Amino acid sequence: KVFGRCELAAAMKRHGLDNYRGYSLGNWVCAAKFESNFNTQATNRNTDGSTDYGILQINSRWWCNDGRTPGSRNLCNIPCSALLSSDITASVNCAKKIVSDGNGMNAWVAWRNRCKGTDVQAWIRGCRL
């Protein structure tokens, strides 16, 4: 499923991401935009044996189990396939865990490179929230 900007904002907000650990909703929308272009089915297969999964491109080495990645930690305790769902719940639950496990939003290269420092509030401007 390919989300609209405002639709994703709403869903993220209902899942409690607005101000989670001090990151305003717009940072989360911005991360998803540049990680996956809002595509819940996005996958990125890396040369390192790991794969990035879903709307926030969560990596298989540390966060989920795909059964094919070396050094697998499965810290979100889920199969990577749960991250390819049209419903964003599993992705949101794991993102919160990533931020809880001693990482900021810097765990997302796209956030660091394309959102950090910008006016992220643009991403939710005009939306019903």
From Swiss-Prot:
It comes from Gallus gallus (Chicken). One of its GO terms (molecular function) is beta-N-acetylglucosaminidase activity. The active site is at E35, D52. Belongs to the glycosyl hydrolase 22 family. The lineage of its organism: Eukaryota, Metazoa, Chordata, Craniata, Vertebrata. CDD domains: LYZ_C. Gene3D superfamilies: 1.10.530.10. Its EC number is 3.2.1.17. PROSITE patterns: GLYCOSYL_HYDROL_F22_1 (PS00128), GLYCOSYL_HYDROL_F22_2 (PS51348). Its main location: secreted. Lysozymes have primarily a bacteriolytic function; those in tissues and body fluids are associated with the monocyte-macrophage system and enhance the activity of immunoagents. Has bacteriolytic activity against M.luteus. It catalyses: Hydrolysis of (1->4)-beta-linkages between N-acetylmuramic acid and N-acetyl-D-glucosamine residues in a peptidoglycan and between N-acetyl-D-glucosamine residues in chitodextrins. This is Lysozyme C.
